[PDB]
Structure formats: structure tokens, C-alpha cells
Design a binder for this molecule. Structure first.
Ligand SMILES: Nc1nc2c(ncn2[C@@H]2O[C@H](COP(=O)(O)OP(=O)(O)O)[C@@H](OP(=O)(O)OP(=O)(O)O)[C@H]2O)c(=O)[nH]1
Ligand SMILES: [Zn+2]
Lengths: 142, 49, 50
């Protein structure tokens, strides 16, 4: 369905072959394509957004509609900030793939599932370490 | 099989002043706000209708 | 993380250096594990309660 992360590219879910080793050339190419497409789309979306912001901005004589026109922009800019934060994550994932150190948990050497990588291709940890880290995070944050 | 309670009626979300504006469901919150604020300032005319 | 082989009844439940996962916990509970050998150095780290 044209709504996921595999949809953005014209790629279909992979299929690990019976005696296929984990990280082979084809899988690495696959994931590189995925990440590059994801990035380029996000950058083009930012370009759209900026053009919209540049076109709309005007000086309104009513204080209760300047807020109206500056309350959708705040949300838009929020989304753009979040995606800007994710572009650095994608760049780092492209560095791990280019360095051929992609597909394993950063905490413990266990390899991260292929289906998990097709779910969230930027995954850095295994589900267990991810959950434990998320707990430590929410506890140090809240 | 889990709902313990339920809203008494739809109108309980808003005050009387805002409750008087018809078709609130289609109005942006800001304009509802000003509507109620100014509506409370209306002056009685000679003949109420 | 295990600092020694976690084992009982002649069975190594967790190899030295492995992070203990939910699966490990389920296996220990399933096997009614209630007593494990530990080295003195592991306890020397600890704070006495009384
Ligand atoms: N659009 C989009 N953004 C993503 C996605 N994944 C991660 N991000 C953003 O990247 C930022 C970095 O996330 P991380 O700190 O690495 O947390 P994570 O491991 O769960 O990804 C996050 O900012 P954040 O401040 O933690 O978000 P929030 O706390 O403001 O909600 C998040 O908003 C994604 O799939 N899509
Ligand atoms: Zn891990």
C-alpha cells in the first residue's frame, strides 16, 4: 500500500533465501536505496513547506486572525523540526551501511531481525535493549 | 464491556454563553471565543424580538 | 549482564557475558531455579544490610 516506507521506493518486501547469509550485497543495496529515497522525499517536502511559508506570510490587521494564521504554521514547523532531527539519523544509518556495520544491535552483538529493519530501517538496537533503554530514558526524562 | 460511565449530555462541555451560539460545531474555536465575548455585550433594543 | 556462567542443576542457563533477556528469566522460573553458585568477588562489591 502506497503509505509505508517500502512503498516510497518501488521495492517490495525482501525474502531471505534458504542458505542466504545475513548481510549480502543485495540486502545492503536494498537498504541503501530505501534510505536514500526516504531522505530525498523528506528534503523535497521541506522545500515545499518553505515555499508555502514564504508565499503566505503577510501582515494581518486583526489580532484574532494573525493567531489563526500562526497556529497552523506552528504545527507545520513542529513537523519540519522533527523530520530535520530524523535526517541526521538517516545520515548516520547511511554511514553504518556504507561502512558495512549495519544490521546488528549496538548494545549486544546480537543481530537485529531483518523484518524489524524493514519495519524501521533506522533501528539501532534489538527490541529488548530498545525497551530497556526506553525505560531508562523515560525515567531520566519525566 | 468496560465503560463505567457516560456523558450526561452533549452540552456539558461549554458554558452558557458559548452554548447559546448556534452551529458551534462548524465554527473555529477562536471565532467562537470572540462570538461569546462580544455577544455578552449586546445592548437591549427598544423592542425585543 | 552475567558476570559468570549462570547455571543450575548441571545446566548453564546464561553464558558468561550475555545480557539477561526476558527469555532467560522465563527459563529460570520454568526450571524452578532457586540457588546459584557465586564467587566471593561478586559479593565483595555489595553493601551489607545489617
Ligand atoms: N517523522 C519522523 N520522525 C522520527 C521518526 N523516527 C524518529 N524521529 C524523530 O527523530 C528524533 C530522534 O529520535 P530518538 O531520540 O533517536 O528516539 P528513537 O530511538 O526512538 O528514534 C525524535 O525526536 P523526538 O524529540 O524524540 O520526538 P518527540 O520527543 O518530540 O516526540 C523523533 O521525533 C520517524 O520515523 N518519523
Ligand atoms: Zn541488544
Amino acid at each position: 500500500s502506497s503509505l509505508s516506507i517500502l512503498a516510497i521506493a518501488g521495492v517490495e518486501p525482501y525474502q531471505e533465501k534458504p542458505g542466504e547469509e545475513y548481510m549480502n550485497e543485495a540486502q545492503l543495496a536494498h537498504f541503501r536505496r530505501i534510505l536514500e529515497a526516504w531522505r530525498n522525499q523528506l528534503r523535497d517536502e521541506v522545500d515545499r513547506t518553505v515555499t508555502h511559508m514564504q508565499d503566505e506570510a503577510a501582515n494581518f490587521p486583526d489580532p484574532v486572525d494573525r493567531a489563526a494564521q500562526e497556529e497552523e504554521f506552528s504545527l507545520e514547523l513542529r513537523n519540519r523540526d522533527r523530520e530535520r532531527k530524523l535526517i541526521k539519523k538517516i545520515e548516520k544509518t547511511l554511514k553504518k551501511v556504507e561502512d558495512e556495520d549495519f544490521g546488528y544491535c549496538e548494545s549486544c552483538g546480537v543481530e537485529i531481525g531483518i523484518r524489524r529493519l524493514e519495519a524501521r530501517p533506522t533501528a539501532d538496537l534489538c527490541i529488548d535493549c530498545k525497551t530497556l533503554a526506553e525505560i531508562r530514558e523515560k525515567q531520566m526524562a519525566g | 464491556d468496560q465503560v463505567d460511565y457516560m456523558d450526561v449530555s452533549t452540552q456539558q462541555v461549554v458554558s452558557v454563553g458559548a452554548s447559546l451560539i448556534p452551529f458551534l460545531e462548524h465554527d473555529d474555536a477562536n471565532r467562537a471565543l470572540m462570538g461569546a465575548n462580544m455577544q455578552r455585550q449586546a445592548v437591549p433594543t427598544l423592542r425585543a424580538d | 549482564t552475567a558476570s559468570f556462567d549462570i547455571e543450575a542443576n548441571g545446566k548453564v542457563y546464561v553464558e558468561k557475558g550475555r545480557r539477561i533477556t526476558a527469555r532467560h528469566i522465563r527459563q529460570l522460573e520454568k526450571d524452578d531455579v532457586k540457588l546459584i553458585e557465586v564467587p566471593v568477588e561478586y559479593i565483595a562489591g555489595k553493601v551489607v544490610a545489617k
